[PDB]
Design a protein around this ligand. Structure first.
Ligand SMILES: CCCCCCCCCCCCCCCCCC(=O)O[C@@H](COC(=O)CCCCCCCCCCCCCCC)COP(=O)(O)OCC[N+](C)(C)C
Ligand SMILES: CCCCCCCCCCCCCCCCCCCC(=O)O[C@H](COC(=O)CCCCCCCCCCCCCC)COP(=O)(O)OCCN
Lengths: 67, 80, 76, 51, 46, 72, 93, 52, 487, 51
């Protein structure tokens, strides 16, 4: 009942599993990791915090510090 | 022209808002006629033509009023 | 379907056409009728129809709620 | 598969005529709560006559 | 890349046609006065 | 339609369990009774328990107190 | 034991509670919290009752619904202004 | 009467899909058509009772 | 009169009795384990019926003194929130015993002993009101799940999965423990009711809340540490893979709903935007990552991460809609993920592939499993009428009461969730068959076709009528959201 | 039916061509009758007695 499991598949499966051996901090990929690791979280954080600030501005209540 | 039979008599029939124009008085017998029949396009004709007469006369009144106002507006575009 | 005759195929195989399907069809109609009777009973039990009909409709033969919601102040 | 074709043929030859008066009859009582027609954006009466 | 310009160009035709409608000024050439209704244009009805 | 047809029995076996010989039971599985009785008890206790339990909650209490208070 | 009925609760606000120092008295905290939540739910159900009333209005109202139910609309909206735990408008009870 | 219109197709499909072996390749089709046809008949009844 | 203590003791009795008998009589071991699990399940259902949903105070409390001063003690007790978790964890265990029923002769009595110990320990976690001892039982699940993963796991990488799982729950756990000790020394007791009614320093709540979140951001798959779940979940047995995504992922959220939201209300407000950003980026990143996966297990392990992250958006949006939808989606996920992982387990136990490309066009061969898989991946879509929709839409509604940006990204999460869910469905059950490596294979037998029936009925019962579940919790949720909010 | 030099077609059924011809005739009659009655109405030749 077990599948034949032809040889030309497990190699690619392990390459997808063992991709951790291919990483050398290339500059283009360094920028790619940096932007999606920091900038997008920062951009969205500004988005939510300013959404709260604008919501509170209309009601007239003072803005929370939001540390 | 003006109103003759409006307000509570108009309110009794479920007259569509916007369909309550100046000569909407005869629309109420018309709408009982539509409910009386099974909404036949050809059975009831005499009562529909008077309402189209209402609307048609209103439409000429509006177009002639605007043609008049355009007539004075034509004098406005005169730079000596 | 050489192998497809071995699967159960809950809704029917490739081309089933059982030996006696007409009797199954008839019992299916009977079951549908029997199961939709309580649906009809429930539907006739709960139906407001706030406005009275202009002409006698095939309703109010099993529905008793007619003009029961023109009292829109004692509403929970 | 010919009877439904016949029914749709007999439909799309008289349904429009039998429904023109009874859905849009320049003030018909067919949309008491189904539709809300704004008095301002109500170009039905003036359309048929001023066009 | 060639197919991309058609989407911009095709939409450019519509906004260009949309610009033409702006330049035509259909709004101010009505042959009719604004509608008048009894009871203060149905103020109690609104 | 008019013809009766063929395929005396529907193809395949339910649950892939081969039918036993005539005159013998299905030889119920060793967990079959302990789990079927569990299902039966759960169904009945939910049917008669969730309905015979009093309808005490904060929605109905608030409903009664809103009806009694809105009149003043 | 059970009262086999509606869960009667004390309408009276609990005593010994001070807004300036709520945390001073812990034994009185929980019943004040329960009373506040119960009153909020009373307001919620009042809003729901008004919503049901306008629900049954709109069917009977017909085309000219504005004319004879406008008074109830304001009553329903003012209830929705101080609703429970909702939008930025937090009521001050 | 009015609850029926929406549940006849659902019930007919449910039985014709759970027990499609019993009704075969033609019984299921004819019974689904029957159920939807009576659904349309009650739809016409509702149209008369509501529209006119 | 059935109390809370008997429910806890039933798995203990089942485990102690099971050790007395030898291993030769394997049928007795499996029978007694299943019987104990089922009677525990029935007891849990009985506890549901006699649950007062009107009052806000806790239900049955059993106090067993721990320190000589009665300073801290086992304070058991359920409420609207903890009851359904107890029911779910009592319901999942018999399923766990039943899935590996065929291989019981290969596993042995250690397998059922471990699972019943897990049931006991997991029940003790949810229904207790002592903050410190809840921490003790909170990571007490390390040992039994470590045994379950390691002894019966992958081929040779089972060692690494155990180490990553055990390592991620050490630094954050003890960094939480430090806050536990500061709370104990500051106030004096760890009783939950006492700790709720305490004035914490404004600057102090930030540190304590951060310490709590650090140990809950590992159980809940947050952005920094969530890579353990895919690898340690593929390298796990099928019955160990159905509680790992069924209960353990609830500890972080339940811990947030118990010892984080009430005790630190203004700290929760001050840290609200940060959690929103983390959850939104987690949803988006996991959604984009899961659509290029070939592992048969991670494909839904990432779906579990996405659902758990979406839970926190409305869990931290203080609102009756948000929290109620949070627990409803939590139960819905506890059912649907369990069902999906059981489907993956039955697929793997026949063919033994752990890939996605091997399977294809098997609808003509296993129609029953095809329908069941379609219904489960259909519930994962969050259709109205299914379990996930009511809870998840309630979360969206509650968050949109507070904020208008982040939960729009949460809703954008499902614009791709449904897409890749149906795409994943169409990898396997659609297309022409490939009988080059699929020579012989069967459909579900009587056991695993009946095992899904509780899942089906619970799913539809969630979908069409969730009022009974919302009925028992609206008091507890409303009390939770209004705590420390005098005005 | 019959073949020309290698292609043969079944004769169209009597119950199909007859209904097709008759139904086309009746819809043509309906169109022409509608033209006779309200033709001037939609072409502005005469208004439906409303002015
Ligand atoms: C959250 C859920 C909300 C409710 C959603 C219900 C929608 C229906 C869900 C199931 C749809 C059917 C999809 C099943 C998988 C599709 C492929 C398949 O496996 O079909 C099966 C089964 O086919 C079925 O579809 C039967 C399932 C029932 C379908 C009808 C569902 C009716 C009940 C649901 C709706 C009830 C009303 C709403 C309830 C409140 C076998 O098909 P065969 O024709 O036998 O092909 C044979 C295979 N082979 C060629 C290889 C030999
Ligand atoms: C293949 C064969 C399958 C057979 C299944 C039954 C056949 C019918 C198939 C249709 C599917 C039915 C699924 C149940 C739908 C119930 C929908 C109505 C439920 C409901 O709202 O009414 C409640 C009834 O409770 C109840 O009594 C409901 C009892 C349902 C028991 C289901 C047991 C599922 C156990 C799963 C456990 C999972 C745990 C996960 C946490 C109480 O309504 P009320 O509030 O008004 O109170 C009443 C006070 N007078």
């Amino acid at each position: 009942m077990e599948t034949n499991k032809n040889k030309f598949i497990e190699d690619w499966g392990s390459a997808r599993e063992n991709l951790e051996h291919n990483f050398r901090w290339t500059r283009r990929n360094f920028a790619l990791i940096g932007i999606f690791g920091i900038a997008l979280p920062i951009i969205v954080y500004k988005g939510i915090v300013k959404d709260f600030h604008m919501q509170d501005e209309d009601a007239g209540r003072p803005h929370r510090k939001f540390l | 022209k003006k109103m003759i039979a409006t307000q509570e008599e108009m309110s009794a029939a479920k007259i569509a808002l916007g369909s309550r124009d100046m000569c909407a008085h005869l629309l109420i017998p018309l709408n009982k006629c539509r409910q009386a029949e099974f909404y036949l396009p050809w059975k009831c004709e005499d009562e529909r033509h008077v309402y189209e007469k209402c609307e048609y006369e209103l439409v000429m009144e509006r177009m002639l009023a605007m043609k008049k106002i355009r007539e004075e507006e034509a004098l406005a575009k005169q730079n000596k | 379907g050489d192998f497809r005759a071995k699967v159960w195929s809950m809704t029917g195989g490739p081309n089933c056409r059982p030996k006696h399907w007409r009797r199954n069809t008839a019992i299916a109609m009977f079951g549908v009728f029997l199961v939709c009777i309580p649906i009809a009973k429930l539907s006739a039990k709960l139906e407001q129809r706030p406005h009275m009909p202009v002409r006698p409709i095939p309703s109010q033969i099993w529905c008793k709620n007619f003009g029961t919601k023109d009292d829109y102040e004692k509403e929970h | 598969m010919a009877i439904p074709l016949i029914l749709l043929a007999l439909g799309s030859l008289f349904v429009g005529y039998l429904a023109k008066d009874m859905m849009i009859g320049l003030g018909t009582n067919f949309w008491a709560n189904s539709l809300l027609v704004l008095p301002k954006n109500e170009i039905l009466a003036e359309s048929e006559f001023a066009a | 890349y060639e197919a991309l310009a058609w989407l911009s160009g095709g939409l450019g035709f519509f906004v260009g046609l949309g610009l033409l409608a702006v330049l035509n000024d259909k709004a101010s050439k009505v042959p009719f006065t604004p509608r008048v209704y009894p009871y203060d244009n149905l103020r109690v009805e609104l | 339609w008019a013809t009766p047809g063929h395929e005396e029995r529907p193809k395949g076996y339910f649950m892939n369990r081969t039918p036993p010989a005539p005159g013998q039971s299905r030889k119920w599985e060793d967990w079959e009774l302990p789990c079927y009785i569990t299902s039966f008890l759960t169904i009945v206790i939910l049917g008669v328990g969730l309905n015979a339990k009093p309808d005490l909650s904060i929605e109905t209490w608030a409903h009664q107190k809103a009806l009694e208070r809105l009149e003043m | 034991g059970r009262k086999k009925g509606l869960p009667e609760f004390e309408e009276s606000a609990p005593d010994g509670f001070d807004p300036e120092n709520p945390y001073k008295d812990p034994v009185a905290m929980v019943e004040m919290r329960e009373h506040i939540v119960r009153e909020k739910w009373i307001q919620i159900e009042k809003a729901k009752i008004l919503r049901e009333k306008v629900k049954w209005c709109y069917r009977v109202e017909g085309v000219n619904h504005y004319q004879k139910c406008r008074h109830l609309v304001q009553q329903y909206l003012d209830s929705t202004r101080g609703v429970g735990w909702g939008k930025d408008h937090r009521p001050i009870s | 009467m009015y609850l029926l219109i929406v549940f006849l197709p659902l019930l007919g499909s449910s039985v014709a899909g759970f027990f499609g072996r019993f009704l075969g390749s033609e019984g299921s089709a004819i019974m689904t058509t029957t159920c939807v046809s009576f659904s349309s008949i009650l739809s016409l009844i509702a149209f008369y009772e509501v529209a006119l | 009169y059935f109390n809370l203590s008997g429910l806890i003791l039933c798995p203990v009795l089942g485990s102690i009795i099971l050790l007395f008998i030898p291993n030769s009589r394997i049928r007795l071991i499996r029978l007694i384990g299943l019987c104990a699990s089922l009677i525990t399940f029935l007891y849990s259902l009985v506890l549901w019926i006699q649950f007062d949903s009107s009052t806000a105070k806790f239900q049955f409390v059993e106090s067993l003194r721990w320190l000589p001063y009665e300073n801290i003690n086992f304070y058991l007790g359920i409420d609207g929130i903890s009851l359904f978790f107890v029911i779910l964890t009592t319901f999942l265990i018999p399923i766990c015993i039943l899935v590996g029923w065929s291989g019981m002769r290969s596993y042995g009595k250690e397998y059922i002993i471990a699972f019943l110990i897990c049931e006991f320990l997991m029940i003790a976690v949810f229904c207790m009101l002592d903050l410190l001892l809840f921490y003790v039982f909170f990571e007490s699940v390390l040992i039994p799940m470590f045994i379950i993963i390691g002894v019966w796991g992958s081929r040779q990488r089972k060692i690494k999965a155990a180490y990553q799982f055990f390592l991620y729950t050490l630094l954050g756990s003890l960094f939480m423990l430090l806050a536990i000790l500061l709370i104990l020394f500051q106030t004096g007791t760890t009783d939950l009711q006492i700790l709720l009614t305490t004035e914490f320093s404004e600057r102090r709540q930030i540190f304590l809340w951060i310490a709590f979140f650090a140990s809950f951001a590992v159980k809940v798959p947050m952005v920094p540490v969530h890579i353990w779940l895919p690898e340690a979940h593929v390298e796990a047995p099928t019955a160990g893979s159905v509680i790992l995504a069924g209960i353990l992922l609830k500890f972080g959220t339940y811990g947030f709903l118990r010892f984080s939201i009430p005790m630190f209300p203004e700290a929760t407000l001050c840290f609200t935007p940060f959690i929103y950003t983390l959850s939104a980026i987690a949803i988006i990143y996991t959604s984009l990552t899961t659509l290029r996966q070939i592992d048969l297990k991670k494909i839904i392990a990432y779906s579990s991460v996405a659902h758990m992250n979406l839970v926190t958006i409305g869990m931290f949006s203080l609102n009756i809609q948000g929290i109620g939808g949070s627990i409803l989606l939590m139960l819905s996920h506890g059912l649907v993920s369990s069902a999906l992982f059981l489907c993956v387990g039955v697929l793997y136990d026949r063919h033994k592939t752990r890939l996605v490309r091997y399977y294809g066009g098997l609808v003509s061969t296993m129609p029953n499993f095809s329908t069941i898989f379609f219904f489960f991946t259909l519930a994962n879509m969050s259709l109205p009428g299914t379990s996930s929709f009511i809870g998840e839409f309630l979360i969206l509604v509650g968050a949109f009461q507070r904020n208008s940006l982040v939960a729009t990204l949460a809703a954008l999460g499902m614009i791709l969730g449904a897409a890749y869910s149906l795409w994943l469905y169409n990898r396997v059950v659609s297309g022409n068959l490939k009988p080059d490596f699929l020579h012989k294979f069967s459909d579900l037998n009587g056991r695993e076709v009946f095992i899904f029936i509780p899942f089906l009925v619970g799913l539809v019962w969630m979908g069409v009528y969730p009022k009974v579940f919302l009925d028992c919790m609206h008091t507890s949720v409303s009390n939770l959201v209004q705590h420390g909010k005098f005005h | 039916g019959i073949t020309y030099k290698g292609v043969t077609v079944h004769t169209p059924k009597t119950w199909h061509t007859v209904t097709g011809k008759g139904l086309c005739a009746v819809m043509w009659f309906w169109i022409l009758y509608r033209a006779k009655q309200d033709g001037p109405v939609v072409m502005g030749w005469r208004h439906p007695w409303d002015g």
